Design a protein around this nucleic acid. Structure first.
Ligand SMILES: CC[C@H]1OC(=O)[C@H](C)[C@@H](OC(=O)N2CCC[C@@H]2c2cccnc2)[C@H](C)[C@@H](O[C@@H]2O[C@H](C)C[C@H](N(C)C)[C@H]2O)[C@](C)(OC)C[C@@H](C)C(=O)[C@H](C)[C@H]2NC(=O)O[C@@]21C
Ligand SMILES: [Mg+2]
Ligand SMILES: [Mg+2]
Ligand SMILES: [Mg+2]
Ligand SMILES: [Mg+2]
Ligand SMILES: [Mg+2]
Ligand SMILES: [Mg+2]
Ligand SMILES: [Mg+2]
Ligand SMILES: [Mg+2]
Ligand SMILES: [Mg+2]
Lengths: 110, 58, 117
RNA sequence: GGUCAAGAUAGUAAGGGUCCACGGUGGAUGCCCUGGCGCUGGAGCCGAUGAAGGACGCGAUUACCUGCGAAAAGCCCCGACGAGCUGGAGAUACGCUUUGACUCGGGGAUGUCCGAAUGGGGAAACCCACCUCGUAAGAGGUAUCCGCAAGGAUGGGAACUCAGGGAACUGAAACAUCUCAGUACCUGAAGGAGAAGAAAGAGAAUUCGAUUCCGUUAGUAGCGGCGAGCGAACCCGGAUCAGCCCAAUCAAGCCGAAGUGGCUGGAAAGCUACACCUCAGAAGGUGAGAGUCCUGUAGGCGAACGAGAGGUCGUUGUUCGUGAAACGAUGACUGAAUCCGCGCGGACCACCGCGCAAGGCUAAAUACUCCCAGUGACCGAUAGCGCAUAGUACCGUGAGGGAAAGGUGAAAAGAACCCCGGGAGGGGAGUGAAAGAGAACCUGAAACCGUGGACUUACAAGCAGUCAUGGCACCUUAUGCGUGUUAUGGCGUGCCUAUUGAAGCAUGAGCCGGCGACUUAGACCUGACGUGCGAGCUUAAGUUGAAAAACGGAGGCGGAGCGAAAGCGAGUCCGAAUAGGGCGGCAUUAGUACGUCGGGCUAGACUCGAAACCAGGUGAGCUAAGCAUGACCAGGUUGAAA
RNA sequence: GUAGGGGAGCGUUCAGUCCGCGGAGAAGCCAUACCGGAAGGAGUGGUGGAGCCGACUGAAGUGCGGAUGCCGGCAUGAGUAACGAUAAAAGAAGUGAGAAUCUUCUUCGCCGUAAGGACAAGGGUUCCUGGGGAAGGGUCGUCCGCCCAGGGAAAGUCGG
RNA sequence: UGAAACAUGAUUGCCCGUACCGCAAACCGACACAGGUGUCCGAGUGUCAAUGCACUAAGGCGCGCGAGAGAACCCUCGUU
RNA sequence: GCGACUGUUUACCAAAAUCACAGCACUCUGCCAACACGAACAGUGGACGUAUAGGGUGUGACGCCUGCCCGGUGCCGGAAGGUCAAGUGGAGCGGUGCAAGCUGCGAAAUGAAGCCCCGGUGAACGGCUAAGGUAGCGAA
RNA sequence: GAAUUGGCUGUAAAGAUGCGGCCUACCCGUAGCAGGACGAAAAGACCCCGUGGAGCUUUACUAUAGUCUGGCAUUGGGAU
């Protein structure tokens, strides 16, 4: 059947990063990354919000109304922002920590 | 084999013509002099269980 | 490469199955019988084109001797008169005159009677 | 207006017919890919340290698959990665992880029971032992064949290799030699290849210089109930290239250039306006179509420590079929020479010439494809592998046989809540661009089943149409034009096959959809067209480059015929010189390579169908019998010998 | 004009080339009275929802009504034959959305060298309890040998 | 020089089978099929006897469509 | 009528007058028997038997019986001779080299079982040309 | 095959619901009956054909397992 291999089970963000949403509805909107699914290619950002219904008879009270929860995306959000908009990444070195390689572009802050 | 057998398929016409008498005749429904639910002539009213007085329970 | 029938047959079939209009039963609904009916229809088609031409002249002649006999004549005789009065070469139209213009038809009967006796 | 009479004519539709609208069924068609096929190249053995292939297990929850192995969805070490992970699993709970999880690359350590199976038994996965060490648990050993012993062998491999054994159908238009064919099949041995191999040779130049393979010679030489048919080798061109010994770079992986605004849209990657990168415009993804948004690509880096003798009899091999049959080969009998020696040169002799058997090894070029990568005038769900995965379900005692099945949406946002119903199912509300996508989820043909409307039908004889006219209806290629339908008239013997002759009471067919039959091959033969060179034309194997073609002249065809042949030659053959056959000049014109088409031949040769014949295997759980060991025959009558 | 020979073309898939079109709607499907001498081709509209037409040239698994052809779906016969031993069944009460068929009570009738009971073979959880009610059950089920979960099987002396 | 045999105490007691159907709706027969399937038990009354025949204990069952009707004909019967 | 009898047969259209049978006959077989299965100098059945036994073939209880033909064929037997294979035996003819030699074919006579030839044989195949039906039966 | 599936006499490939002519017949069912539909079923089993097959037979042809027989091996020593 395939799934999110078309990339390399490789993302461009971490479960902390602030990211802007390029493409579709919720375009430009920004938010913290709260769930990163690399193989599935999923991002849970405070962006796309959904209203999910609850099929819950026996399941903790039959009072299973409507829930406010955010619904995941792909690469339809360009990772990491600082000059107010979406960017690529190029300059790596080290901070105080040598073992780590940072990221940056036309500027130099992530 | 299966000795007398049909010679030709019977057409949609011919098949249908034979069914011109298969139509059910709707019951002649009467209205109960009491409980006022409909009933069958010469039978106890289903609803109240009446047939001049009350014979059957409910 | 592979080249399956797809679309070609169904189109070929719908064409035939549309010539089948007020065709009774299977003759309008199933291809093989619709098509088969048309082969025989072809015979009738080509034949009835040259047949109508005999059919009409027949109708034409019938109306002529009817009126010819109204004025104490007949087709055989009347036509010979018009033929004998070489001047008269109606042939086509002649039936409509008998049917619509009785005044006019009489004139031609009277002319035909002359050229003869 | 009324009664009576005489005529004529309408409407009814139980049900049917044609057409239209809307549906249901069903899964064609289109689009797609999660799956296959072929060719090219790579790589190529596994096992007593216990395989191939299995049984039973291991999960908080576990039926199936995966991975594993009581240390059990994993344990330890090294490396890479740098934030997620807790297998498919669409599933909650418990948790694990920058003191670097997960995954990937490389080692180890554990690996129940079965299987060569190996302690002994056994109806695989189970029974039953003995011996040594030991605190019990628990650990180690106990098979035969080789050899002193170290150490080797049993068994498994798709096809390929050699060997032992070896069909018949079929061709011969019958059949028996012959062909099919040393093919198919069985058996043995082995490897990544094997085989063969270092001249008692080929052979006619006193040339050659191990073998295998490819082109070619050449359908020549030859074999042949001289029939069907079978069919070499030498020379030459080419791939690769060795002769030696005895006996007396590629996987993990990291780095990697450059676009922004407006517009259409549910959604931009499209359109538009200006912009940049390019050793990178190959490719996949992202709400639609992508150089510059992600993964990448060109280019570069890159690992601790990881791979690369003669004879007679009988027969036979090769073109070798008893032929004039040489030579090899060997079952039976015999049986020599030793270099002024032996074997060969297609009976045989002499001469001339080639070569040293009776000991062993030997890489490369060759073959095949279980597996891996790349590619395609290969397939895209009746195709393609049997399988979009299953050797499953199902069938069979067994050998064996054997399916079909794909698709919500961009994302689960998988429809809370309401209404009828026990439910199923629906209607709403909400989500979404669309629910004209609702989980019997893309399109959704046709047969087939319905509801509704139009025109119609209850005195009618019918291959169901066709022509003509009238009536009714309708107006989106469509108002003189028709479109639908309908009454009456005329005319009218389904289709195919097979056939002297088919409506035939001759064959086939229930209907629809899909699948379903003149092909492909060969340096083959012969002809039409065509092109390029043209008295000449042309390459084959290969070699080198391959986002591609060039080289390669070995060989093939014209170029001289006539003869049985020697041979002679515009002549030649019968013959003793005169007649003639065939050929030349002809009055005289040309071929060759490739292509497409006609036809031929050889293969399954347009597709489908035998009865049968042959090979190896599976069956006596049915039935025919045999052997071993058990079981069974109420009751009554009759009344033998002794 | 049959066998047959000869000529010119239409259509399908794939390919190379060029011109393009497409979410302001591609292919496919559906309707049609338009065009061409025919195979056929176009316009408009309707559905669909992501790909595709035209022209030249090339190559084919290239055109179906037939084969008692193959696969699949659906018809006819037809609401027909049958519903599997002629050992019956009746009423009451109960349960339930629903009862000829399920439970219970009282009768009836059939077997009784069996139509009772105990092994063996063979089958494999069919056993018991609680639930279920799609399909299987020739009807119907509230029930079942069917479906779900839990449980149940005990040996020195019986078989091996 | 601590035998065998007996007697009384203690200890010991391995593995597989055992549910259920089993002349049948659970086995073989494609079916909940009028067939087939080895052994054992198999009561009473009557009838010479009996495992025969009739009825009946114990036990099991009424055979998983039903209800009317009372034609032709067809099946299985009774009488003539 | 047929078959003596009990029995056996065509699973699935034939139950019989079929087959079997007790009994009779011909015949082969001397023991590592004949005969049979088999790759086989294996092994085994025959048989852990031994001619009062075993194989084959026919007829089919019991009773009275079973005739004629030995030409053809088969089986057993004889052998005066004719015919016959490889082999032993090599007389002769022929090739080639100058030559010894090396070579190609090859008679006569001898050489086995078989066959022709003679006798036998019928509960041998058969017949009613080798003979033409003895009893008994007969329109079965 | 599809059916809008009458009788008589003809004709036709020679046994006509489908051709000709004449005749009869309003539409549709239910229970029944078997004359026809050359009714169904099994690509005639008879018959002939095919240079088809198989089973069987023999003094048809050819071979052959088996078996009889001469020679040569295993295979030797003495007497005539
Ligand atoms: C009992 C049912 C059984 O039928 C019979 O057995 C009867 C008795 C048998 O009659 C007979 O076989 N026979 C033999 C003669 C007497 C009887 C007969 C014949 C004709 C009519 N009626 C009886 C047939 C009529 C006979 O046909 C006849 O065959 C003859 C060869 C030619 C006849 N033609 C001319 C019409 C044909 O009918 C065939 C050959 O069968 C066996 C038919 C084929 C199709 C067949 O096998 C059926 C499937 C058959 N098998 C099965 O399981 O069921 C069937 C139907
Ligand atoms: Mg499809
Ligand atoms: Mg598979
Ligand atoms: Mg015929
Ligand atoms: Mg068809
Ligand atoms: Mg009844
Ligand atoms: Mg009544
Ligand atoms: Mg008898
Ligand atoms: Mg008897
Ligand atoms: Mg009847």
């Amino acid at each position: 059947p395939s799934a999110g291999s078309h990339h390399n089970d490789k993302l461009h963000f971490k479960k902390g990063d602030t990211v802007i949403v390029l493409s579709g509805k919720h375009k430009g909107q920004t938010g913290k990354v709260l769930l990163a699914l690399p193989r599935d290619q999923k991002v849970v950002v405070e962006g796309v919000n959904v209203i999910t219904k609850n099929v819950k008879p026996s399941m903790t009270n039959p009072q299973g109304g409507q829930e406010q929860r955010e619904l995941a995306l792909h690469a339809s959000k360009v990772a990491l922002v600082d000059p107010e908009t979406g960017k690529a990444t190029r300059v790596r070195k080290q901070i105080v920590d040598g073992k780590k390689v940072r990221v940056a572009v036309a500027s130099g802050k992530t | 084999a299966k000795h007398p057998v049909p010679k030709k398929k019977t057409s949609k016409s011919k098949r249908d013509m034979r069914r011109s008498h298969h139509a059910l005749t709707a019951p002649n429904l009467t209205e109960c002099p009491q409980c006022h639910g409909k009933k069958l002539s010469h039978h106890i009213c289903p609803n109240c269980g009446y047939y001049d007085g009350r014979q059957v329970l409910a | 490469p592979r080249a399956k029938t797809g679309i070609v047959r169904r189109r070929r079939h719908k064409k035939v199955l549309k010539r089948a209009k007020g065709f009774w039963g299977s003759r309008s609904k199933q291809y093989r019988n619709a098509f088969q009916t048309l082969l025989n229809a072809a015979t009738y088609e080509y034949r009835d084109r040259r047949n109508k031409k005999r059919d009409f002249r027949r109708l034409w002649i019938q109306r002529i001797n009817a009126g010819a006999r109204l004025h104490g004549m007949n087709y055989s005789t009347f036509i010979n008169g018009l033929k004998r009065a070489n001047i008269d070469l109606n042939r086509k139209v002649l039936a409509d005159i008998a049917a619509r213009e009785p005044e006019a038809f009489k004139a031609l009967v009277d002319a035909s009677r002359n050229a003869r006796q």
